[model samples]
Target: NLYFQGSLRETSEGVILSVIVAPNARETKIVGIDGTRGRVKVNVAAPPVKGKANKELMKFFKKLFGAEVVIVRGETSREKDLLIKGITKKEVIEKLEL
Candidate 1:
C-alpha cells in the first residue's frame, strides 16, 4: 500500500514531475510521502491556464490500470496532494512506461 502526498504533473509518454505546478514553470514534479518522501516525475504540454494542466492530468491517468487518480485536495493551489486509489506498481510503471 502506498500513500503519496505531494504535487503532480503530466508529461510525454506519461507524467514527469518533482514539485507543484507553478505559473512560471513549464513543468513540475510529484513527491511521494509515506514515512519519507521520494520523487515521482511527470511532465505536461498543457499550459497553466483555466485548469488545462489539471485536465491533461486526468487524460494522463486514463490509460493507467485500476487508476482512480484525482485531486482529492488543492484544486486551486499549485501545490496539490493527490489521491490515486486502486493503482498498482506495475500499472504505474506500465502507464508511466518507465
Candidate 2:
C-alpha cells in the first residue's frame, strides 16, 4: 500500500486534493496515489465531453469524501484541484487506505 502527503493538503475548512483523472475507462475506480506527482489517479467511465467527465469525477469524490466537493481548477483538463468541504485531510487518508 502506498501513502501520500502533498496530494492531500490541509485547508481552513477541509482539504484540497490534487488529482489526475482518466476519462472513458473500462471501469471507474481510484487507481492509487501517484508518489512522484503526489496526486490521486482516478479512472472514470464517462466520456470527456460536455462536462460529463467532470461531473463523474465530482460524483466519485462526493462518494468518497461525502458532504460537498467542488473543483477549484482544471475544469477542462485531466489534472484538477478539488476542494473537499466538511472532511479533513486525515479522514481522506484513512478512507484511501481501504
Candidate 3:
C-alpha cells in the first residue's frame, strides 16, 4: 500500500492525486472497485485521437466530482500524475468509498 503526503484538501477547490493513467478501458471506477487499484478507467466514446483520453478524463471528472481535476504531471505520457483540487482526503476516500 502507498500513502500521499500532506492533506489532499486545500490544493485548489481540494485534493491532488498522482496517478498513472490507463487511457483505454471499459468504464470509470470512482473507487476503482478493487480490480484496478483506485484509478478510474474510462471508456471514451471517442477514439484515442489527439489525447482524447485526457480530455475524456477531465470530462469524467466534471461529471463525477464537479471539481477541477487536472493533470499536473506526465501530460505527454500514460504514467500521468493528477491533481484533484478542492476535496479532503477523507472526503475523497469516503466519496469513492475505498
Candidate 4:
C-alpha cells in the first residue's frame, strides 16, 4: 500500500498529500492505515457543517504532525488534498503507523 510505501510528493512549499476524511465521528483521529492510493482515512469529531469539520481537520493535522497544514483541495468534500509543511513523507508514514 502507498500508505506504507509513502506516496507523498515534494514541492517548493511542502509535501502534498491526498486524504479521505469521514466527518461526524465519535472522536477525531486516524482510522485507517491503508486507504486508497495516495490517500489515508481520518475520523473527524466535528460535524460537516459550516466548515467546522474542516477546522477540526486542520487541528487534527496540526496535532498529528505538529507542522503547518493546509487543504489545497476538497475543502467541502469527503476526499481532500493537503499540503504539510516542515515534514517528510517518510516521517508521516512512520507516525501513521502508530
Candidate 5:
C-alpha cells in the first residue's frame, strides 16, 4: 500500500485531500486509493446531475470526518481537491488505510 500513501497534504488549518469521485453508485463509499493518480477514490450514491453528485461527495466527507469540507478545485469535474478543516493527514491515512 506504499505506506498507505495517497494525495493528502498537511496544512495549517487541517489537510488538503485529492479525491476522484465516481457518481451514480448504489451507495456512498470509499472505494480505494488510486496510487497511480495519487487520489482517494470514492463512490457517490447521487447522480452527476448539476450539483447533485458534488453535494453527496461533500456530505459524505463532512459526515465521515465531522469536519468542514470545501471543494478547493474541480467542483464540476470528477477529480477534486478538498480543503478539510479539523482533520489531520495521519487521521486521514488511518481512516482510509484500507
Candidate 6:
C-alpha cells in the first residue's frame, strides 16, 4: 500500500474517501492519487449526464472494494466524496494500491 495523505477518514459509518474524477475518459479506472490534494484520481468513461457518471463510479467502487459504496458529497461535480461501508483505511489502501 502507498502512503495515504489524509484523503481517507474513518467514521462510524465507513471510510470516507476524497476523489477527483475525470469524466469521459477512454476507460473507467483509478488513474492515480493526487498526493498534494490527498485525493484519488479516477478516469470515468461515462459522460457526466444526469448522474450517469456518478452511477458508474459508485458501481466501479463497489466492485473495486467489494463493499457498499455510496456518495457522501459532490454528486454533481468532478470532485467527489465516497463512503465505502464496512472497510477500513488499511483495506482501502491495499485495495486501491495507494
Scored by lDDT, the top model is: 6
Compute each candidate's TM-score over C-alphas: 0.48, 0.90, 0.60, 0.82, 0.87, 0.90
Q: Which scores greater on lDDT, model 2 or model 4?
A: 2
Better of 1 and 6 by lDDT: 6
**lDDT values for all models:** 0.48, 0.84, 0.54, 0.76, 0.84, 0.87
Off by over 4 Å in 6: none
RMSD of each: 8.3, 1.2, 4.9, 2.3, 1.8, 1.8
Candidate 6: tens digits of C-alpha lDDT, residues 1-98: 45554679988988998999999888998877788778888899899898989999999999989999999899998889999998888898778773
Better of 5 and 6 by lDDT: 6
Task: Report residue 23 deviation for candidate 4 (angstroms).
Answer: 1.1
Model 3 worst lDDT window (10 residues): 1-10
lDDT of 1 by residue, 1-98 (tens): 33332323443333332224434335533323324333343455577778877776655555443455666545776545455565444445544443
lDDT of 6 at 66: 94
Tens-place lDDT per residue, model 5, 33-98, is: 888888888899999898998888889888777788999889999999988887888887776664
Model 3 quality (TM-score) = 0.60
Q: Choose 3 or 5, whichever is better by TM-score.
A: 5
Regions more than 4 Å wrong, model 4:
33-37
Candidate 3: RMSD over Cα atoms? 4.9
Candidate 6: global Cα-lDDT? 0.87
Residue pairs clashing, model 3: 13-86, 14-85, 14-86, 14-87, 15-84, 15-86, 15-87
* Model 3 CA deviation exceeding 4 Å by range: 1-13, 30-48
